[PDB]
Amino acid sequence: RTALSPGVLSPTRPVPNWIARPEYVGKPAAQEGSEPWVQTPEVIEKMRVAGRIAAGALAEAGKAVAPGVTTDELDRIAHEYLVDNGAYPSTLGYKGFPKSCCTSLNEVICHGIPDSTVITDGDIVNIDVTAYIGGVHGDTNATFPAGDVADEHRLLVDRTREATMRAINTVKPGRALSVIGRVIESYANRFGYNVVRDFTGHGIGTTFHNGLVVLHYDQPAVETIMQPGMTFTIEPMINLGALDYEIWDDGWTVVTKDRKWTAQFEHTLLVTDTGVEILTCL
Ligand SMILES: CSSCC[C@H](N)C(=O)O
Ligand SMILES: [Co+2]
Ligand SMILES: [Co+2]
Numbered sequence: 001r002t003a004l005s006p007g008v009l010s011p012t013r014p015v016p017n018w019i020a021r022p023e024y025v026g027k028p029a030a031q032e033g034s035e036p037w038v039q040t041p042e043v044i045e046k047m048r049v050a051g052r053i054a055a056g057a058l059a060e061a062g063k064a065v066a067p068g069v070t071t072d073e074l075d076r077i078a079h080e081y082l083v084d085n086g087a088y089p090s091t092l093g094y095k096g097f098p099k100s101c102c103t104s105l106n107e108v109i110c111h112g113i114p115d116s117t118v119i120t121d122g123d124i125v126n127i128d129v130t131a132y133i134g135g136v137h138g139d140t141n142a143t144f145p146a147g148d149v150a151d152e153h154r155l156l157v158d159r160t161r162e163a164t165m166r167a168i169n170t171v172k173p174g175r176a177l178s179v180i181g182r183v184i185e186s187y188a189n190r191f192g193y194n195v196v197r198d199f200t201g202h203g204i205g206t207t208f209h210n211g212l213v214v215l216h217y218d219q220p221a222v223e224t225i226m227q228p229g230m231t232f233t234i235e236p237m238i239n240l241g242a243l244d245y246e247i248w249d250d251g252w253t254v255v256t257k258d259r260k261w262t263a264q265f266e267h268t269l270l271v272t273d274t275g276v277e278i279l280t281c282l
Contacts, residue, residue: 001120047279051279054087066147070115074101104128124261138280156193168234174226185217194239204231204233
């Protein structure tokens with residue numbers, strides 16, 4: 001299959017006007033970056049509802065992954081599940097992003113835009129979906145195989161999933177945050193993969209990316225200690241080839257320079273009083 005090129009973007013999907021928009025919608029920037037890392041009990045409970053709903057939207061768009069389907073079509077299914085459940089799609093109008101999820105085929109690392117692109121047999125596609133409901137966000141993504149995927153690509157997907165889950169199972173209060181990126185990177189390196197450094201996980205709460213940064217590679221200079229009530233994502237991008245990338249002129253789509261494929265999984269995590277809870281399960 002040849003290297004991807006930009007497809008054609010369908011017009012802005014509407015969302016019912018009664019659904020509250022995040023503040024950043026239709027503005028050039030978002031007011032985020034300086035919010036508290038530890039959330040209130042109320043915000044946490046609200047994030048469980050946002051997380052469930054984004055998990056539902058993700059599993060529904062993933063069902064439609066099949067040779068012949070377009071990315072635009074995955075967006076539509078995800079959009080429709082968020083809206084039917086009262087959530088705003090956080091990606092929509094975030095810094096000018098035009099769709100309700102990111103769709104990231106094969107050599108696209110992240111931030112791909114749903115479009116006329118038709119999925120072909122053997123492809124892998126990441127769907128990344130975020131829900132905003134009750135003044136809070138819930139963020140989750142996953143890579144789905146399309147028909148008959150080559151063994152090297154199934155293993156990549158399976159091992160990216162496993163890295164992500166291993167990292168999550170280390171989350172506990174009083175443990176250093178740098179532990180996550182140690183675990184992910186050892187695991188990736190074990191099988192010859194390379195972890196994307198330039199994109200990271202993030203704190204998330206009443207804002208989308210609240211200023212907390214979770215590195216997916218080994219960086220022990222970070223002194224952040226996990227505390228009960230902290231909410232963040234773990235979202236590692238793992239490459240078969242080299243880490244160098246380019247961005248499309250749409251300004252969002254990141255693609256591996258060598259055009260080798262790449263995969264990603266994401267959950268939204270709560271640090272509990274003794275451990276972790278995954279907020280983006282069905
Ligand atoms: C184009 S919206 S910013 C990246 C999308 C994703 N939901 C994330 O931040 O994990
Ligand atoms: Co995220
Ligand atoms: Co995401």
